[PDB]
Amino acid sequence: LKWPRDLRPLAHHDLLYMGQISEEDRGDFNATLRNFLVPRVVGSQKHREVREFIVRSLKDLDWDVEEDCFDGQTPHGIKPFCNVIATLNPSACHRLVLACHYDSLLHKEGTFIGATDSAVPCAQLLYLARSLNGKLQNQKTRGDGLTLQLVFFDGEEAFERWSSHDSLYGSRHLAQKWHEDRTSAERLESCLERSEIANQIDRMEVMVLLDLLGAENPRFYSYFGETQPVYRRLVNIESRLNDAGLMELPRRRRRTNYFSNSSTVGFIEDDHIPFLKRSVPIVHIIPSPFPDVWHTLDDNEQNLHHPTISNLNKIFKAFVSEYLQL
Ligand SMILES: [Zn+2]
């Protein structure tokens, strides 16, 4: 089966531009990232501050922002949860959805920053919205029926031992909410010819979920055959960036190889699951293996690898540009 949207290769000019960074771009990203490098456990003041910062940053860019708030039972009692959904053009039928979670694990051993999990992904999504703002606002005027949507899930982490009932609180809630929210092509702006739209979940054209990013030398694989055409664009973009000499490497004459051209046999539970169960196509941008710092007190700021983060930001910027033809 072909991808429902013909995927036009990024022109060289655009690839080079998406692959550059000024030191002020680096500084802008780091400034954004500092806002997330704090404990943000569900129910806490800093958690509320982080949500407020996400919401304000995106409202300031003239995105439509929904705070999807609810209370849910947990092994620790009733807890408040608030997903944040930012949509560049609400009326556009189809959404390229980029996602991550913004809560941090309540770690039994002490204060836990969750720098890779997922403070960096949070910052990457905001940095994309900020750095591509002009181009995105231009794209929004086309009436082409496609837009960008950013979802910051709350309550990804378990309070106790990960289970179907203790984990993915925000994503389980949102997927069900959108599945039950009925709509059709006539109510929406420029749906593709062959689109079957019965509810809001059908408008998610593909969900690209970023998680556990920020450690050196991540290895990604295509986890879903369904989105192999999309995944292959990340492979190609990374290859073109290396060919252009636009990746930061430790030594001359090396290449990044983050996006492997293989598939793996690996089952990961994450925020994508409740959407996958409802036929949303998923690209899961998560390393295999997980970073060594995963769910340890060492998942902190100093253990981030900034050259890797810069390289990923170039891939992601080029990918959004290519998908939306910015
Ligand atoms: Zn985690």
> What secondary structure does DSSP assign to 140-158, as a single string?
HTT--SEEEEEEEES--S-
Contact 192, 5 (CB under 8 A): yes
CA of 293 to the centre of ligand 1 (A): 10
CA of 139 to the centre of ligand 1 (A): 34
Count of Cβ atoms closer than 10 Å to residue 228 Cβ: 16
Contact 112, 39 (CB under 8 A): yes
Q: Which tokens go with 110?
A: 């002490």
Strand order in the sheet with 94-101: 64-74, 77-87, 146-153, 94-101, 204-210, 282-285
Specify the pairing of strand 64-74 against strand 77-87: antiparallel
Report the C-alpha gap between 159 and 298 in whole angstroms: 19
Contact 322, 8 (CB under 8 A): yes
Please count the CA atoms within 13 angstroms of the CA of 36 that sit on its side-chain side: 30
Look up residue 107 and give its DSSP letter: -
Write out the binding residues for Zn(2+): 117, 157, 295
Q: Which tokens go with 313?
A: 């930001």
Lookup result for tokens 């992601």: 316
Q: Which tokens go with 309?
A: 């983060």
Q: Which tokens go with 48?
A: 């509320």
Helices (H), the chain: 12-18, 23-34, 45-60, 120-131, 133-140, 169-180, 228-243, 273-276, 306-324
Report the C-alpha gap between 307 and 7 in whole angstroms: 29
Q: Mind telling me the catalytic residues?
A: 156, 211
Is residue 182 classed exposed, middle or buried when 0-12, 13-18 and 19+ CB atoms within 10 A define those classes? Answer: exposed
Contact 136, 148 (CB under 8 A): yes
Residues in the chain: 326
CA of 105 to the centre of ligand 1 (A): 6
Residues 6+ apart with CB under 8 A from 224: 231, 276, 281, 282, 283, 284
Lookup result for tokens 């190889």: 257
Look up residue 28 and give its DSSP letter: H
Report the C-alpha gap between 251 and 266 in whole angstroms: 32
Experimentally, the structure was elucidated by: X-ray
